[PDB]
Design a protein around this ligand. Sequence first.
Ligand SMILES: *[C@H](O)[C@H](C[C@@H]1CCNC1=O)NC(=O)[C@H](CC(C)C)NC(=O)OCc1ccccc1
Ligand SMILES: *[C@H](O)[C@H](C[C@@H]1CCNC1=O)NC(=O)[C@H](CC(C)C)NC(=O)OCc1ccccc1
Lengths: 301, 301
Amino acid sequence: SGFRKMAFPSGKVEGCMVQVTCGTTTLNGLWLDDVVYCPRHVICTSEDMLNPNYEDLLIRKSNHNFLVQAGNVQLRVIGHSMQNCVLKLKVDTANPKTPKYKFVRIQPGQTFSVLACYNGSPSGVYQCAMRPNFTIKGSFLNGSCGSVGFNIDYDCVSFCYMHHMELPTGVHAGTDLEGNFYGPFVDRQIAQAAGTDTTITVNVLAWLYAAVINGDRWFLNRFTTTLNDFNLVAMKYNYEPLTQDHVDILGPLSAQTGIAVLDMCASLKELLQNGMNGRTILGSALLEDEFTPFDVVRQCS
Amino acid sequence: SGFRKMAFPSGKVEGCMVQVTCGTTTLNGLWLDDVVYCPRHVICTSEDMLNPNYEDLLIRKSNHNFLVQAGNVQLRVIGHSMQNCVLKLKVDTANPKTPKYKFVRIQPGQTFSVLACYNGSPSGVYQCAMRPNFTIKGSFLNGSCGSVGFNIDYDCVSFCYMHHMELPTGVHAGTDLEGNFYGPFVDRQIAQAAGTDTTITVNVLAWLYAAVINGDRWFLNRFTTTLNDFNLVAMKYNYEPLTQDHVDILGPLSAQTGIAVLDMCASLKELLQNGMNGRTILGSALLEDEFTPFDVVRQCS
Ligand SMILES: *[C@H](O)[C@H](C[C@@H]1CCNC1=O)NC(=O)[C@H](CC(C)C)NC(=O)OCc1ccccc1
Ligand SMILES: *[C@H](O)[C@H](C[C@@H]1CCNC1=O)NC(=O)[C@H](CC(C)C)NC(=O)OCc1ccccc1
């Protein structure tokens, strides 16, 4: 028993992290096979980041302008291209620690693990959710760009995120591994506004089920609600609308606990209108929304 | 910017996990050099666990009663010894992935990463504090015994915890790698209970400092307080007394923020006396006590 924000073991991803230096810009890169993927803004200078023309800055570069360091071993850049916002550096050595991997684009509401790296060396591992407004609430300092977010399935690492920037509000933004930003952001050093964020309702419900599975039952009630009457309340508190597809995905958790999804919705509705009144759920005084139904099942039983 | 509960990169510990089987009991072991460490209750059967004499159970065992798997490869047990509640199984192969490592016993209030494992396979990683009552609030299912807690310092993995059991309140109990329990618990299926817990004051202060470092000041005030005057409010709120040694350890954070320790204590005092009035700190509606001062400095720098 017990319930914790839990990351995937990071070994397979640690063996893929390298340092990429171009001029006096150093960030992290992902060495898979004979390719190193990194944020394209590594080619920019301090004054170039204000509003760069990347196709121009890149045509003025050659292989020898990219210093790639794998621990101490300097890798030789023998090629390069640009795919949207990522640089792909062809190198002479294929990464021997390369795991079974995929590149995937995750949906808002899904979670993943982040290996925070600086100068090519892992610093720590933590879980994030892709917020509905396509930002993530990370922990990223100068030098952390090129850090990846990922999930593991069987022995396969599905890379889903590469870090590029921090917004003025302090949340974080980046791309999938094909270089397309999550959300309406660009890799230019200019203030950019995230859309208004909202709470991931299906995740809150899963976490309430995790709580019941762990013996937290004070918030249950005998009332029930319609899906429509529930979404009317969620709208008021800035919660994502709940669809039948979400209701269907909570099926397993509803079955394990014997609590109908709409009954749990009645619980959530009560919690929203009245707060918790000094009580907690799995150690939080807030309604947690960074646990998917999958995250709940994986950790409960 | 940003502040997350962050685990150490776990790759060096994944390489040390193995499966250990005796009878029909299976749990995890820690393979370092030619020794596999695991909980001794792996030699117990269903009936044994109620009231076992481990010396008497172990004399009755042969090396070949122990099945150890490192991935696909069976490892041959060539010796065995019992040290307190831990079993040391000598094997015919030194772990080639053995990292620089030490065994240490941690103090109440310190933190470590847990690599949750099942059938010798890493499952996830998260951060824990050793509570003042010598339990941890972990996430552990059947099969997880032998999972280890650790910190990393430069190249050295310091192992500090091995998982053995769950208490009735849903918290977790275990030993150091010498097999000596943390807290007054025993590895048998009898009724036992955690002592009364308290909040780790020094850590709450470390976290308030992280909140200021990351740009948040709403909870500060113009007041101040003497150590004794602070500790009188602490005792009333079930917080550990704050010592001058805690104050000294909080020095560097005090210096980076320009906020005197005792001034942050008056802030905490006001927070305890008033609550938070619907506001949050680093995304929590509760005062977080599972970050040490070292955790803050490490993540914020
Ligand atoms: C990449 O290493 C870095 C990550 C930022 C810096 C601090 N925390 C992060 O997540 N990225 C940048 O500096 C990035 C480069 C542009 C060409 C997009 N720009 C950025 O994030 O600027 C905003 C900012 C910079 C420094 C501190 C706070 C915000
Ligand atoms: C070892 O794999 C296991 C870990 C427990 C299982 C549930 N969560 C954990 O942390 N340890 C035991 O089952 C332990 C065996 C003794 C003879 C040392 N007893 C134990 O934890 O008893 C309480 C319990 C067992 C099963 C489910 C819930 C609580």
